[PDB]
Amino acid sequence: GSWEIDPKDLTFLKELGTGQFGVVKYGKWRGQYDVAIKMIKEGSMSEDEFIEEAKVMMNLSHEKLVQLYGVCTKQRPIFIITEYMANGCLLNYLREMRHRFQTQQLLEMCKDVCEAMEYLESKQFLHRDLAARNCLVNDQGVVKVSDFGLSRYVLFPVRWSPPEVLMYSKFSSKSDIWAFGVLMWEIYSLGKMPYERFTNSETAEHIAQGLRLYRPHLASEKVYTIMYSCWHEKADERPTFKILLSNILDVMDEE
Ligand SMILES: CC(C)OC1CN(C(=O)N[C@@H]2CCCCc3cc(-c4ccnc(Nc5cnn(C)c5)n4)ccc32)C1
């Protein structure tokens, strides 16, 4: 099948880390092309459901999405083969103080993610776990969005969730928007934990009381207005990703 990679075409080279489905490794496809390979631990995934959705996810092609190249399903563990991102997770990247980021670079990261998300929104596809931990950085410093949709197959992101999610499990395009605002806060805070002094339970109470994250020192007033617009209490008063991208591009021009 066009979604199927022969595992004999893979050369495993390095271990990258361990996520919700087990170990992820760096390797080569057909001796030449860099890939990341998720080795899906038995019992961790709703595999048949994922395999059917992987057909849809293959056709999500945008330069700012970490591409799904295919799956290896004829065996267990199954494998998910994706684009390899040389500089790893955005969260860890932001926390490395040696980068000495310019705020123009931080805004560019937000724009990268916003473009990916505008594409997903145009396909009526929710990420469902948008956060710096699910963005990666390539060898050119481009940020791409990773593992969109995959939480559906896990057999909770309190700090990235709007009130209607925490109170009613009301998931929508506007809960991705809320999460994006939090991600913008992570970026401008160089990787701090949102609501860092609170537990998840205290964060949920804070959010239900109407309180919000406040301005990271590196965010201008115009950048803070953008992330804060993602956190309106009423979901329908939150922007779309098309509007956010316009907003971010405008600020990039104004500097
Ligand atoms: C959304 C939730 C429900 O599920 C999802 C499945 N999931 C999950 O597997 N995460 C792990 C997190 C721990 C580390 C292992 C890793 C690696 C990569 C990956 C992909 C492409 N390139 C690179 N490159 C590169 C360079 N250095 N390092 C260190 C990495 N790395 C993606 C994800 C994950 C969360």
Coordinates of C-alpha atoms and ligand atoms in Angstrom, one line a residue:
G1 CA 0.0 0.0 0.0
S2 CA 1.1 3.6 -0.7
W3 CA 1.1 4.2 3.1
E4 CA 3.3 1.2 3.7
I5 CA 7.1 1.2 4.1
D6 CA 9.2 -2.0 4.0
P7 CA 11.0 -2.2 7.3
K8 CA 13.9 -3.8 5.6
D9 CA 14.5 -0.4 3.9
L10 CA 15.4 1.1 7.3
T11 CA 18.8 1.4 8.9
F12 CA 18.6 2.2 12.6
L13 CA 21.4 4.5 13.7
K14 CA 20.7 6.4 16.9
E15 CA 18.2 6.6 19.7
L16 CA 16.4 10.0 20.0
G17 CA 14.3 9.4 23.2
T18 CA 11.1 7.8 24.5
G19 CA 7.6 9.2 24.2
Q20 CA 4.0 8.1 24.8
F21 CA 4.4 5.1 22.4
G22 CA 7.9 4.1 23.4
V23 CA 11.3 4.6 21.8
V24 CA 12.0 6.9 18.8
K25 CA 15.1 6.4 16.8
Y26 CA 17.0 8.2 14.0
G27 CA 17.9 6.2 10.9
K28 CA 18.2 6.0 7.1
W29 CA 15.6 4.9 4.5
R30 CA 17.2 3.1 1.5
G31 CA 20.7 4.0 2.7
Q32 CA 20.3 7.7 1.8
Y33 CA 17.4 9.6 3.4
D34 CA 17.2 10.7 7.0
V35 CA 14.0 9.6 8.9
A36 CA 12.7 9.3 12.5
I37 CA 11.2 6.0 13.4
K38 CA 8.7 5.6 16.2
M39 CA 8.8 2.0 17.5
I40 CA 5.2 1.6 18.9
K41 CA 5.2 -0.3 22.1
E42 CA 2.7 -3.2 22.3
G43 CA -0.4 -2.1 24.1
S44 CA 0.3 1.6 23.9
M45 CA -1.8 2.4 20.7
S46 CA -5.1 1.8 19.1
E47 CA -3.3 0.4 16.1
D48 CA -6.0 -0.5 13.6
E49 CA -7.7 2.9 14.1
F50 CA -4.3 4.7 13.7
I51 CA -3.5 2.7 10.6
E52 CA -6.7 3.8 8.9
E53 CA -6.1 7.5 9.9
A54 CA -2.5 7.3 8.7
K55 CA -3.9 7.3 5.2
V56 CA -5.4 10.7 5.8
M57 CA -2.3 11.9 7.7
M58 CA -0.1 11.1 4.8
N59 CA -1.9 13.6 2.6
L60 CA -1.3 16.4 5.1
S61 CA 1.5 18.0 3.3
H62 CA 2.7 21.4 4.4
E63 CA 6.3 22.6 4.7
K64 CA 5.7 23.5 8.4
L65 CA 4.3 20.1 9.4
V66 CA 6.6 17.2 10.3
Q67 CA 5.7 14.9 7.4
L68 CA 4.5 11.3 8.0
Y69 CA 6.3 9.2 5.4
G70 CA 4.6 5.9 6.1
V71 CA 4.0 3.1 8.5
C72 CA 5.3 -0.5 8.9
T73 CA 2.3 -2.5 9.9
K74 CA 3.0 -6.1 8.8
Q75 CA 4.9 -6.7 12.1
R76 CA 4.7 -5.8 15.8
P77 CA 6.0 -3.4 17.0
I78 CA 4.6 -1.3 14.2
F79 CA 6.7 1.7 13.1
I80 CA 5.7 5.2 12.2
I81 CA 8.3 6.8 9.8
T82 CA 8.5 10.6 9.8
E83 CA 10.6 13.5 8.7
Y84 CA 13.8 13.8 10.8
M85 CA 14.3 17.2 12.6
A86 CA 18.0 17.6 13.3
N87 CA 17.7 20.1 16.2
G88 CA 15.1 18.2 18.2
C89 CA 12.3 19.4 20.3
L90 CA 11.3 23.1 20.4
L91 CA 10.9 23.0 24.2
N92 CA 14.4 21.9 24.8
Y93 CA 15.7 24.3 22.1
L94 CA 14.1 27.3 23.8
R95 CA 15.6 26.3 27.1
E96 CA 19.2 26.3 25.8
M97 CA 20.5 29.7 26.8
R98 CA 23.4 29.6 24.3
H99 CA 21.1 30.5 21.5
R100 CA 20.7 34.1 22.8
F101 CA 17.5 34.4 20.7
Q102 CA 16.4 37.7 19.1
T103 CA 12.7 38.4 19.5
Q104 CA 12.5 38.4 15.7
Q105 CA 13.6 34.7 15.8
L106 CA 10.9 34.0 18.5
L107 CA 8.2 35.6 16.3
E108 CA 9.4 33.6 13.3
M109 CA 8.9 30.4 15.3
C110 CA 5.4 31.5 16.1
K111 CA 4.8 32.2 12.4
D112 CA 6.1 28.7 11.4
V113 CA 3.7 27.0 13.8
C114 CA 0.8 29.4 12.8
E115 CA 1.3 28.4 9.1
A116 CA 1.2 24.7 9.9
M117 CA -1.9 25.3 12.0
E118 CA -3.7 27.4 9.4
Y119 CA -3.1 24.5 7.0
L120 CA -4.6 22.0 9.5
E121 CA -7.5 24.3 10.1
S122 CA -8.1 24.5 6.4
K123 CA -8.4 20.7 6.4
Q124 CA -10.7 20.7 9.4
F125 CA -8.0 18.7 11.2
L126 CA -7.3 19.3 14.9
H127 CA -3.9 18.9 16.5
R128 CA -5.5 18.1 19.9
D129 CA -2.1 18.4 21.8
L130 CA -0.5 21.6 20.4
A131 CA 2.4 22.6 22.7
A132 CA 6.1 23.3 22.4
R133 CA 6.8 19.7 23.3
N134 CA 5.1 18.7 20.0
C135 CA 7.1 21.1 17.8
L136 CA 10.5 20.2 16.4
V137 CA 13.3 22.3 14.9
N138 CA 15.2 21.4 11.7
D139 CA 18.8 22.0 10.7
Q140 CA 17.8 25.4 9.3
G141 CA 16.1 26.5 12.5
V142 CA 12.6 26.1 11.0
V143 CA 10.0 25.0 13.5
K144 CA 7.4 22.4 12.4
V145 CA 4.4 20.9 14.1
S146 CA 4.6 17.2 15.1
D147 CA 2.3 14.3 15.9
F148 CA -0.9 16.1 15.0
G149 CA -3.9 14.0 15.8
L150 CA -1.9 11.2 17.4
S151 CA -3.4 11.5 20.9
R152 CA -6.6 10.0 19.6
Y153 CA -4.8 6.6 19.6
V154 CA -3.2 6.7 23.1
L155 CA -4.5 3.8 25.2
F156 CA -3.9 15.3 29.7
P157 CA -2.7 18.8 28.6
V158 CA -4.5 20.8 31.3
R159 CA -2.2 23.8 30.9
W160 CA -2.9 24.0 27.1
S161 CA -6.7 23.7 27.5
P162 CA -9.5 26.3 27.4
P163 CA -12.2 26.4 30.0
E164 CA -14.8 24.7 27.9
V165 CA -12.5 21.7 27.6
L166 CA -11.7 21.5 31.3
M167 CA -15.3 21.9 32.3
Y168 CA -17.3 20.1 29.5
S169 CA -14.7 18.3 27.2
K170 CA -15.8 20.6 24.4
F171 CA -13.0 20.2 21.8
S172 CA -13.0 22.3 18.7
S173 CA -10.9 24.5 16.4
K174 CA -11.0 27.0 19.2
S175 CA -9.3 24.7 21.7
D176 CA -6.4 24.4 19.2
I177 CA -6.4 28.2 19.1
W178 CA -6.2 28.4 22.9
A179 CA -3.3 26.0 22.9
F180 CA -1.5 28.0 20.3
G181 CA -1.7 31.1 22.5
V182 CA -0.1 29.1 25.3
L183 CA 2.6 27.9 22.9
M184 CA 3.3 31.5 21.9
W185 CA 3.7 32.1 25.7
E186 CA 6.1 29.1 26.0
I187 CA 8.2 30.5 23.1
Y188 CA 8.4 34.1 24.5
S189 CA 9.1 32.7 28.0
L190 CA 12.1 30.6 26.6
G191 CA 10.5 27.4 27.6
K192 CA 9.0 28.0 31.0
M193 CA 6.2 25.8 32.2
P194 CA 2.8 27.6 31.7
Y195 CA 1.5 28.4 35.2
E196 CA 4.8 27.2 36.6
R197 CA 4.0 27.6 40.3
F198 CA 0.6 25.8 40.1
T199 CA -0.4 22.2 39.8
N200 CA -2.7 21.1 37.1
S201 CA -5.6 21.1 39.5
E202 CA -4.8 24.7 40.6
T203 CA -4.3 25.8 37.0
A204 CA -7.8 24.5 36.2
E205 CA -9.3 26.5 39.1
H206 CA -7.3 29.6 38.0
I207 CA -8.6 29.3 34.5
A208 CA -12.2 28.8 35.6
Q209 CA -11.9 32.0 37.8
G210 CA -11.0 33.9 34.6
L211 CA -7.4 34.4 35.3
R212 CA -4.7 34.2 32.6
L213 CA -1.0 33.8 31.9
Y214 CA 0.6 37.2 31.9
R215 CA 3.1 38.9 29.6
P216 CA 6.5 37.3 29.1
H217 CA 9.2 39.9 29.4
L218 CA 10.4 39.3 25.8
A219 CA 6.9 39.8 24.3
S220 CA 6.1 43.3 23.1
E221 CA 2.6 44.7 23.8
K222 CA 1.6 43.8 20.3
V223 CA 2.8 40.2 20.7
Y224 CA 1.1 39.9 24.0
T225 CA -2.2 41.1 22.5
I226 CA -1.9 38.3 19.9
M227 CA -1.4 35.5 22.4
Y228 CA -4.0 36.9 24.8
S229 CA -6.6 37.0 22.0
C230 CA -6.4 33.2 21.9
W231 CA -7.7 33.0 25.5
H232 CA -11.0 34.7 25.3
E233 CA -13.5 33.0 27.6
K234 CA -16.0 32.6 24.8
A235 CA -14.6 30.2 22.2
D236 CA -16.3 32.0 19.3
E237 CA -14.6 35.3 20.1
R238 CA -11.2 33.7 19.6
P239 CA -9.5 34.3 16.2
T240 CA -8.9 31.7 13.5
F241 CA -5.4 30.7 12.5
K242 CA -5.8 32.7 9.3
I243 CA -6.4 35.8 11.4
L244 CA -3.6 35.0 13.8
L245 CA -1.2 34.5 10.9
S246 CA -2.2 37.9 9.5
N247 CA -1.6 39.4 13.0
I248 CA 1.8 37.8 13.3
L249 CA 2.9 39.0 9.8
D250 CA 1.7 42.5 10.6
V251 CA 3.9 42.6 13.8
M252 CA 6.9 41.2 11.9
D253 CA 6.6 44.2 9.6
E254 CA 6.2 46.7 12.4
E255 CA 9.1 44.9 14.2
Ligands
LIG1 C1 1.0 13.7 20.8 C2 1.3 12.5 21.7 C3 0.1 11.9 22.2 O1 2.0 11.5 21.0 C4 3.3 11.8 20.4 C5 4.1 10.5 20.0 N1 5.2 11.3 20.7 C6 6.5 11.0 20.8 O2 7.0 10.0 20.2 N2 7.3 11.9 21.4 C7 8.7 11.8 21.5 C8 9.3 12.6 22.7 C9 10.6 12.2 23.3 C10 11.8 12.2 22.4 C11 11.6 11.3 21.2 C12 10.8 11.9 20.1 C13 11.5 12.2 18.9 C14 10.8 12.8 17.8 C15 11.5 13.2 16.6 C16 10.9 13.3 15.3 C17 11.7 13.8 14.3 N3 12.9 14.2 14.5 C18 13.4 14.1 15.7 N4 14.7 14.6 15.9 C19 15.5 14.7 17.1 C20 16.8 15.1 17.2 N5 17.2 15.1 18.5 N6 16.1 14.6 19.2 C21 16.2 14.4 20.6 C22 15.1 14.3 18.3 N7 12.8 13.7 16.8 C23 9.4 13.0 18.0 C24 8.8 12.7 19.1 C25 9.5 12.1 20.2 C26 4.4 12.4 21.3

